[PDB]
Design a protein around this ligand. Structure first.
Ligand SMILES: CC(C)CCC[C@@H](C)[C@H]1CC[C@H]2[C@@H]3CC=C4C[C@@H](O)CC[C@]4(C)[C@H]3CC[C@]12C
Ligand SMILES: CC(C)CCC[C@@H](C)[C@H]1CC[C@H]2[C@@H]3CC=C4C[C@@H](O)CC[C@]4(C)[C@H]3CC[C@]12C
Ligand SMILES: CCCCCCCC/C=C/CCCCCCCC(=O)OC[C@@H](O)CO
Ligand SMILES: CCOC(=O)c1oc2cccc(OC[C@@H](O)CNC(C)C)c2c1C
Length: 439
């Protein structure tokens, strides 16, 4: 049965190396992925690669042989490297957390304030400082316990149990794990809050309309481009090409850039708003509404125009009277609900709750932030037990077993393999993985 562990432990090392060398190379070779965030992810993957190559294997040999085989020097270095990788990870995660806060609050929503060069420096500092705090206390022997069971393990070359004194145990854990952990959970929950608060009509309509850069057909079969910019009701592609050229002011050939579609969208939302205040029936309702329900109203007029939306006379009467669940029932009784539901259901829910709850993690940059959060969340779950039980061993020392300790450490080790999987949520990372896997 001890063979079982051997296979189990060998399969783990491989997945850590395979997975992480993939992530490293994906970013190194593909420009679409050479961003500040992915620079920090490289720092993360590096730490898990050194973990898999230099750390886990000698952890498996230690367990399976019930002894150290590698002498005192590598015993010390193995420990110092191990601690480094865990520390450099969590601070890198804390940095990712911080960088995303400054991005989401800056007018340049979703893009880092740091330059690529600036990001290289932060990483280098993280590694240098982590390299100090990890190696130095160990080479200088400041970590060491003085009780007999411990001093015996030191003089014995074949023993490499991590015995420390309670002072270092507290000091190392707080500075290495707890401080960057607690900052990261507090800061990143605040980035999640900013994403949701900063949601506006432009992102809303970008979610339930998409962006296509070449001429397509809507669900009605009318020619459309950009973010739901209708070209003509006519069923002639040349008439649609004719309208595009006039709307942009150049020969387009039925294709546009992201810059050109953005100002059509900006004119379209202006128009739907200008329509609202021009219309007799729509004007009052809009004023009565909070900035969120207002956005839902614009959304509709974007899809249907003022005349069509003013037709919901029953429902418009109640949004004005703040009777939210009564309007929502009358909006479901519609051709609009029938025609397209994935989109209507969201709009109605917005009118109902007055919240963005229906649009959570629908935007690409928001899906991107969720992934990062899943990395962070998983790292916490995998390591926290170990570190909690670490510090419980300092207070009442005779409560946690060596078997329990080692096992909780291995729940940590196995975290070095989860990131590459999680990154399969990113479409940019998928296309990258398959190109590299030749598929
Ligand atoms: C002490 C031993 C065991 C581990 C040390 C590994 C060192 C050499 C590695 C781990 C992580 C690495 C960094 C991670 C990725 C960044 C960003 C990249 O755009 C340039 C290189 C740079 C700046 C790397 C420099 C070297 C680095 C610090
Ligand atoms: C004890 C053993 C595991 C240590 C082996 C050292 C390895 C992990 C280090 C030493 C130099 C490092 C590399 C130096 C900089 C490059 C270029 C960068 O664009 C991506 C990271 C990458 C590819 C690093 C990956 C990790 C690396 C290969
Ligand atoms: C159950 C878990 C088992 C996991 C099974 C996986 C293990 C396979 C072996 C990995 C060794 C490491 C190989 C490194 C990865 C090679 C892929 C790669 O990086 O390719 C780049 C190349 O295409 C540039 O052009
Ligand atoms: C016993 C008291 O614990 C710590 O002081 C401590 O602080 C730390 C800070 C960061 C990383 C740490 O390593 C996690 C484990 O993979 C180490 N692998 C063992 C076998 C040494 C530690 C440790 C063990």
């Amino acid at each position: 049965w001890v063979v079982g562990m051997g296979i189990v432990m060998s399969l783990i090392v491989l997945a850590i190396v395979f997975g992480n060398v993939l992530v490293i190379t994906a970013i190194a070779k593909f420009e679409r992925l050479q961003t500040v965030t992915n620079y920090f992810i490289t720092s993360l993957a590096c730490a898990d690669l050194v973990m898999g190559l230099a750390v886990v294997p000698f952890g498996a040999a230690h367990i399976l042989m019930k002894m150290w085989t590698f002498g005192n020097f590598w015993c010390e270095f193995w420990t110092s490297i191990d601690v480094l990788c865990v520390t450099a990870s969590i601070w890198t995660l804390c940095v990712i957390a911080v960088d995303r806060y400054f991005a989401i609050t800056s007018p340049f929503k979703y893009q880092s304030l740091l330059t690529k060069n600036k990001a290289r420096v932060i990483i280098l500092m993280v590694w240098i400082v982590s390299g100090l705090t990890s190696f130095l206390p160990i080479q200088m022997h400041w970590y060491r316990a003085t009780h007999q069971e411990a001093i015996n393990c030191y003089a014995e070359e074949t023993c490499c149990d991590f015995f420390t004194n309670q002072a270092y145990a507290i000091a190392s854990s707080i500075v290495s794990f707890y401080v960057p952990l607690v900052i990261m959970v507090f800061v990143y929950s605040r980035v999640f809050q900013e994403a949701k608060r900063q949601l506006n009509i432009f992102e809303m309509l970008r979610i339930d309309e998409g962006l296509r850069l070449k001429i397509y057909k809507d669900t009605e079969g009318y020619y459309t481009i950009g973010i739901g910019h209708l070209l003509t009701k006519s069923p002639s592609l040349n008439a649609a090409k004719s309208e595009l050229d006039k709307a942009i002011g150049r020969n387009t050939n039925g294709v546009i850039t992201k810059d050109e579609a953005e100002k059509l969208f900006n004119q379209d939302v202006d128009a739907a708003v200008r329509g609202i205040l021009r219309n007799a029936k729509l004007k009052p309702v809009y004023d009565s509404l909070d900035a969120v329900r207002r956005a839902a109203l614009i959304n509709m007029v974007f899809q249907m125009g003022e005349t069509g939306v003013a037709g919901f006379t029953n429902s418009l009467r109640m949004l004005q009277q703040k009777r939210w669940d009564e309007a929502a029932v009358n909006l479901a009784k519609s051709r609009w609900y029938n025609q397209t539901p994935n989109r209507a259901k969201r709009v109605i829910t917005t009118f109902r709750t007055g919240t963005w709850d229906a649009y959570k993690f629908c935007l690409k940059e928001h899906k991107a932030l969720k992934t990062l959060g899943i990395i962070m969340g998983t790292f916490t779950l995998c390591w926290l037990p170990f570190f909690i039980v670490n510090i419980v061993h300092v207070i009442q020392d005779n409560l946690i077993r060596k078997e329990v300790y080692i096992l909780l450490n291995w729940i940590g080790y196995v975290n070095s393999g989860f990131n590459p999987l999680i990154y399969c949520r990113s479409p940019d990372f998928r296309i990258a993985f398959q190109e590299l896997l030749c598929l």
